[PDB]
Symmetry: C2
Subunit: 137 residues, 2 copies
């Protein structure tokens, strides 16, 4: 039986700028770094950055919708998003609305998101305005 | 401040085989589906499958090391890996480390892993035998 996410590993092209992004800008906790990786945490999330020379930076328009969303509170959402925009972090666009979200890119083109709300809240919102063809179980 | 992982979204080329893989083979709970996606949960993890005409079925040699690891107990590890092997699920890497990991692919080539153990356990092992250039914080 699977019990949840154990860790998320992102391939990165240059370790130092990636560590700085996740630690200094996003405020995650840095536990360890070595010549080819780093371990960080964000609440319960174990994030691994792995140096990979096969990592390419693709424009968001030519990469798929795979993306990673981080939780933030209602009170902090707007000011954190504004801090990212003032730091010059690039944005990307999703094809549909999924509530209060801000979409941004990491230095290697990984698609990130700040989102306010749980799965339960999302399902309740979708019941009031469902996506096309929606069925609930 | 960020409090954890809110959701993981995987782009998929075809919804039906991906729902079959995550719900039926891996045992995740299906909460809702619509014409272009699905919401599942695995413990605390909120997983979204998003139908994307830009997603290609990608061989493991053509993608980088970015991957997603799910938690499982040591007692369930071997039987779960055997279930994946019976279903013909491809393996993309051999575990060459101490500790239990099984590296497998989803129908679109997303790189997945079963792993036993926490960040705290990994840090303790690394303190005893550090990687090259390792610094702790
Ligand atoms: Mn999202
Ligand atoms: Mn891993």
């Amino acid at each position: 039986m699977l019990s949840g996410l154990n860790h998320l590993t992102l391939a990165v092209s240059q370790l130092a700028p990636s560590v700085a992004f996740y630690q200094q800008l996003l405020g995650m906790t840095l536990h360890a770094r070595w010549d080819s990786g780093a371990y960080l945490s964000c609440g319960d999330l174990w994030l691994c950055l792995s140096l990979d020379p096969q990592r390419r930076v693709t424009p968001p328009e030519e990469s798929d919708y795979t993306h990673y969303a981080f939780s933030i509170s209602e009170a902090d959402f707007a000011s954190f998003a504004a801090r990212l925009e003032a730091a010059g972090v690039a944005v990307w666009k999703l094809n549909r609305s999924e509530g209060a979200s801000h979409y941004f890119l990491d230095p290697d083109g990984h698609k990130l998101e700040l989102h306010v709300g749980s799965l339960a809240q999302r399902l309740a919102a979708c019941r009031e305005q469902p996506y096309k063809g929606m069925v609930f179980f």
